[PDB]
Amino acid sequence: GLPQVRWRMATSWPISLDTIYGGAVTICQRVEEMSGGAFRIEPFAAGEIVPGLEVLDAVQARSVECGHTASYYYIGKNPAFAFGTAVPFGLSAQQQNTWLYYGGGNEDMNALFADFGAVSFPAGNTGGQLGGWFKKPIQNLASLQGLKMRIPGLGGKVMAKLGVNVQVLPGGEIYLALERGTIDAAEFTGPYDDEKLGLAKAAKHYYYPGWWEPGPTLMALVNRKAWSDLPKEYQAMFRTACYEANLGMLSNYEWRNSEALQRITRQGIKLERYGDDILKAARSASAEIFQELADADAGFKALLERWRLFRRDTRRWNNINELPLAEFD
Amino acid sequence: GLPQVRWRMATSWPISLDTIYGGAVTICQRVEEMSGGAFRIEPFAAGEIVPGLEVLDAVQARSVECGHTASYYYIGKNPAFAFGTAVPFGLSAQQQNTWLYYGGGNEDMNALFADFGAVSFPAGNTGGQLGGWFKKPIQNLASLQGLKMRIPGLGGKVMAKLGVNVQVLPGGEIYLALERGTIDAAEFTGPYDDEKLGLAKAAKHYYYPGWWEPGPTLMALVNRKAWSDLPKEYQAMFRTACYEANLGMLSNYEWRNSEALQRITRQGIKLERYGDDILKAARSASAEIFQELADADAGFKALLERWRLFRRDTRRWNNINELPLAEFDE
Ligand SMILES: CCCC(=O)C(=O)O
Ligand SMILES: CCCC(=O)C(=O)O
Ligand SMILES: [Ca+2]
Ligand SMILES: [Ca+2]
């Protein structure tokens, strides 16, 4: 007889986003199915029991046993957490999964989460993000000066160096903030989530690419001690379920964003590519931010150099095995 | 008490093909771990209990309960099985997973396997394959006329329409055949597997891309009646373990191929892009082959048109959300 385990999972997400909230639900449903009801986890939307941006805090305190969040929400505690979500001009979703599972990423991220009493598992990806929504159209790089924009992580810091006034909001809050006039622009994920949250209603000017988040990972987090007290069978169920959340969510976003792109263009939204004045300035600002973080911390520097090497090698591989068919019509 | 289930899994793979055999091992180990030993599956290498090309036949007959194979080994039984692995100029591994899980592909493939008493689950990908190994560099499309090349499946049929003299050889045999002068060229999967077979020693010209296999799926198969007999808990364990095999294998190949590519370029291998004359002729010959299959069968035609639509839409999406960052090299 294995125990009846009953857990709660705090998430960073609103229930309306069945893509990303769906990853948390998948983990909870699958351990219940595999355990025949002996191992249950109740998922909660952002703000129900824990604020969306404080999932790691609640997991560390053990006010919940586990969570579903984005590591880059905690760059204030350790800028190295950025690599476990996405960094500007960083890894594709497929490269990010390769880096986590076989390039040393999951070991690097678990070493950081160990400092906050937690263990981490990849448990979602949005795939490549788009460039966000603007109430007024962008004319050139100088159009960004003084804009109030919702955008998190090191992407936010890059946009701040370009003169954007970066605002902190969980996904659920963006539409009201855009309507009330609190902000002038926002990015979230892509067509499917952006349209569902009402971003295409609040703003008409959509850009690409989302160079800040080329393949952002969502992590399942478990309290170290809660994880220790789990029998080996239930650890295996949870760990395996997170692979389904990770591959299942990426595939779900690819499908839903592909349909939503067609829907919003038919409904009147025009998608524009960012000018090279913005892309060049973003790349340069990103290099400056990573240089500063590296000079301030040998651990960050060492991780940045291992990740940069992984990135160079995997891009060289994908330039041969994938890019030629992607660009040939 | 849930039952003590003991199954056997027939695989299409030698144990030396370890990244792919590893997918089968992952499923077997993970259901044993999650069930605390109550659900065990014993994996077998190709030939040990069932020939590698007869996994589906063995699963249908229930001589084994489950299998790990490539749907495109069964195109002689139904050419529609091709889409469940890879087709020339088809889907990237990421697009292939999107198509299977959400685009209707798993439902299409399960309707085909239902004819043979089987249910199917995605359970691996090699990722994009390369264009194979050539002793002498290719000058142009006419250089392929009469060239003796190891290349199997629909890829071989396309290369045949380009005038290639298609040679059938096992993985293990290609090195000797290249050295002996028996064949002029050969493809397998990519740098990791190809280096282990000695192909970097036998030839200096490695072509790309492998337009015949842009993201080949490996499928777990279960006998429909064996699956029916399985408690709901063990079904969930098996189905979930196949997601780990699928994402795990692709990521493992990406890592191994990226490392092996660096080793073989240091060993003086030249990476050559196929000329547009070959890529245009191959795309056209592939479209002719799929046209003939479609004209001979309304069910094939319908599936080809659903897949072509999914492919157009996903490519349109990836041209926006991925290609811009992928094509700028620093
Ligand atoms: C990582 C998914 C959520 C996100 O991209 C964001 O909060 O912007
Ligand atoms: C998917 C493995 C089979 C193959 O690609 C080959 O033998 O060439
Ligand atoms: Ca975002
Ligand atoms: Ca091959």
If you write DSSP's letter for every residue of B126-195 in order, what string do you get? Answer: --S----EESS---SGGGGTT-EEE--HHHHHHHHHTT-EEE---GGGHHHHHHHTS-SEE--S-HHHHH
Asked if residue A134 lies in contact with residue A205, where contact means CB atoms within 8 angstroms, the answer is yes
> Nearest 5°: phi and psi at A123?
-155, 35
- Among A252, A109, A313, which Cα is nearest to B191's? A313
Go through A3-21 and write b for each residue having 16 or more CB atoms within 10 A of its CB, e for each that does not: eebebbbbbbbbeebebbb
| β-bridge pairing B5-11 and A217-223 | unpaired
What is the C-alpha to C-alpha distance for residues B239 and A108, in angstroms, rounded to an integer? Answer: 29
Q: Which two tokens stand for residue A74?
A: 């905690």
Quote the minimal CA–CA distance from A235 to chain B in Å. Answer: 8
Rounded Cα–Cα distance for residues A238 and A9 (Å):
12
Give CA–CA dist A320/B20, Å, rounded.
Answer: 21
Whose CA is closest to B289, among B197, B162, B128, B203? B162
Instruction: Identify whether residues A183 and A281 lie together within a single domain.
Output: yes
State both tokens at B233.
């808990």
Helices B93-101/B298-321 angle, 10° precision: 120
DSSP secondary structure, B261-291, as one string: HHHHHHTTPEEEEPPHHHHHHHHHHHHHHHH
| Helix/strand/coil (H/E/C) assignment for every residue in B210-267 | CCCCCCCEEEEEEEHHHHHHCCHHHHHHHHHHHHHHHHHHHHHHHHHHHHHHHHHHHC
Write down the residue that tokens 């520097």 correspond to: A301
| Cβ within 8 Å of residue B159, ≥6 positions away | B144, B149, B151, B166, B212, B282
CA dihedral B39, B45, B49, B54 (to 10 degrees): 100
Residues in chain A closer than 8 A to B262 (CB atoms): 313, 316
- CB of B126 within 8 Å of a chain A CB? The answer is no
Question: Given an 8 Å threshold on Cβ–Cβ distance, is B322 in contact with A92?
Answer: yes
For chain B, give the longest Cα–Cα distance. 68
Q: Residue ranges of the alpha helices (H) in chain A?
A: 20-34, 55-61, 93-102, 105-114, 153-161, 174-179, 191-197, 199-202, 224-228, 232-266, 276-295, 298-321, 323-327
CB contact under 8 A, B258 and A313: yes
Nearest CA to ligand 2 atom 2: B189
Cβ density class A158-177: b for 16+ within 10 Å, e for less: bbeebebebbebbbbbbbeb
Q: Which positions ≥6 away from A120 have C-beta within 8 Å?
A: A71, A84, A106, A109, A110, A113, A219, A220, A221
Residue A248's closest chain B neighbor by CA?
A: B101
Q: How many CA atoms lie within 13 A of B183 on its CB side?
A: 25
Our CA angle for A187, A153, A192, nearest 5°, is 30
Do residues A15 and A88 share a domain? yes
B243: closest chain A residue by CA? A244
Q: What is the spatial distance between Cα B3 and Cα B179, in angstroms, rounded to a whole number?
A: 54
Q: Which of residues 96-115 of B touch A (CB under 8 A)?
A: 97-98, 100-103
Q: What are phi and psi of A235, to 5 degrees?
A: -60, -50
**What gap in Å lies between CA A324 and CA A17, rounded to an integer?**
34
The Cα–Cα gap between A260 and A270 comes to 13
Q: Are residues B166 and B189 in the same domain?
A: yes
Does the beta carbon of B186 sit less than 6 angstroms from any atom of ligand 2?
A: no
Q: Could you count the other beta carbons within 10 Å of the beta carbon of residue B266? A: 8
| Virtual torsion, Cα A281, A286, A289, A292, nearest 10 deg | -100
- Which protein residues touch ligand 1 with a CB less than 6 Å away? A 70, 85, 126, 152, 171, 188-189, 213, 216, 218
Does residue A309 belong to the interface with chain B, where contact is any CB pair within 8 Å?
Answer: no
Number of domains within chain B: 2
DSSP H or E stretch at residue B105: helix B105-114
Beta bridge partners of B119: B222
Tell me whether residues B30 and A247 touch, CB distance under 8 A: no
Question: How many angstroms is it from B218 CA to the middle of ligand 4?
Answer: 12
> Tokens for A147?
């804009």
The answer to whether A48 and A7 have CB atoms below 8 angstroms apart is no
Of A144, A171, A170, which Cα lies nearest the Cα of A158? A144
Is the same domain home to B184 and B279?
Answer: yes
Among A244, A261, A273, whose Cβ lies nearest the Cβ of B240?
A244
Same domain, B205 and B216: no
Joined tokens for residue B63: 């001589």
SS (H, E, C) B301-312: HHHHHHHHHHHH
Residue carrying structure tokens 């007869």: B54
Residue B216, ligand 2, Cβ within 6 A: yes
φ and ψ at B17, to 5 degrees? -85, 70
Query: Does any CB of chain B come closer than 8 Å to the CB of residue A246?
Result: yes
Tokens of B18: 């370890």
**In a shared domain, residues A144 and A233:** no
Contact state of A232 with B103 under an 8 Å Cβ cutoff? no
- Residue A175 identity: Y
Which atom in ligand 2 lies closest to the alpha carbon of residue B187?
8
Walk across the sheet containing A66-69 and list its strands. Answer: A39-44, A5-11, A66-69, A217-223, A118-125
* Cβ density class B31-50: b for 16+ within 10 Å, e for less: bbbbbeebbebebbbbeeeb
Contacting B residues, span 56-85, partner chain A, CB-CB under 8 Å:
none
Dist CA B173 CA A137 (whole Å): 62
Residue with the two structure tokens 């219940």: A32
The answer to whether A72 and A84 have CB atoms below 8 angstroms apart is yes
B23 lines ligand 2 (CB under 6 A): no
Secondary structure of residue A135 in the 3-state scheme:
coil
Give the contacts of A284 (CB within 8 A, at least 6 positions apart): none
Q: At what angle do helices A232-266 and B298-321 cross, to 10 degrees?
A: 90
- Nearest residue of B to residue A241, measured between CA atoms: B240
What is the identity of the amino acid at B219?
Answer: M
Expressed in angstroms and rounded, the spacing between residue B189 Cα and the centre of ligand 4 is 4
B72 in the same domain as B151? no
- In terms of domains, do B49 and B1 share one? yes
CB A158 within 8 A of CB A212: yes
**CB neighbour class for A93 (10 Å; exposed up to 12, middle 13-18, buried from 19):** buried
- Beta partners for residue B43, in sequence order: B9
Which among A90, A91, A83 is positioned nearest to A109, based on CA atoms?
A: A83
Asked if B288 and B309 sit in the same domain, the reply is no
Q: After which residues is chain B broken (C to N over 2.5 A)?
A: none
Picking from A92, A95, A261, the nearest residue to B316 by CB comes out as A261
Q: How was this structure determined?
A: X-ray
CA–CA gap between residue A305 and residue A328 (Å, rounded) = 33
- Cβ(B193) to ligand 2 under 6 A? no
Residues B131 and B99 in one domain: no
Backbone angles phi, psi at B189, to 5 degrees: -140, -60
Neighbours of B302 (CB within 10 A): 13
Strand B165-167 with A270-273, pairing: unpaired
* Subunit contact A237:B237, Cβ cutoff 8 A: yes
DSSP for residue A131: -
End-to-end CA distance of chain B: 60
Q: Which atom of ligand 1 has the smallest separation from the CA of A152?
A: 8
Which is it for strands B5-11 and A39-44: parallel, antiparallel or unpaired? unpaired
Burial of B182 (0-12, 13-18, 19+ CB in 10 A): middle
Instruction: Say whether residue B151 is in contact with chain A using an 8 A CB cutoff.
Output: no
Q: Are residues B18 and B91 in the same domain?
A: yes
State the residue range of the domain holding B200.
126-211+269-296
Q: Look-up: residue for tokens 């829907």?
A: A263
In degrees rounded to 5, what are phi and psi of residue B137? -65, 150
What are the tokens at B293? 């299959």
Structure tokens at B64: 């084994």
CB < 8 Å to A92, chain B = 322, 325-326
- Residue A129 marked in a binding site: yes
Q: What is the stated resolution of the deposited model, in angstroms?
A: 1.8
Residues in chain A closer than 8 A to B257 (CB atoms): 317, 321
- For helices B298-321 and B105-114, give the axis angle rounded to 10 degrees: 150
Query: Are B144 and B195 in the same domain?
Result: yes
- Cα of B291 to ligand 4 centre, how many Å? 23
Ligand 2 pocket test, pick from B13, B187, B189, B194 with the greatest ligand atom count within 8 Å of Cβ, gives: B189
User: Pairing mode, if any, of strands B133-134 and B205-208?
Assistant: antiparallel
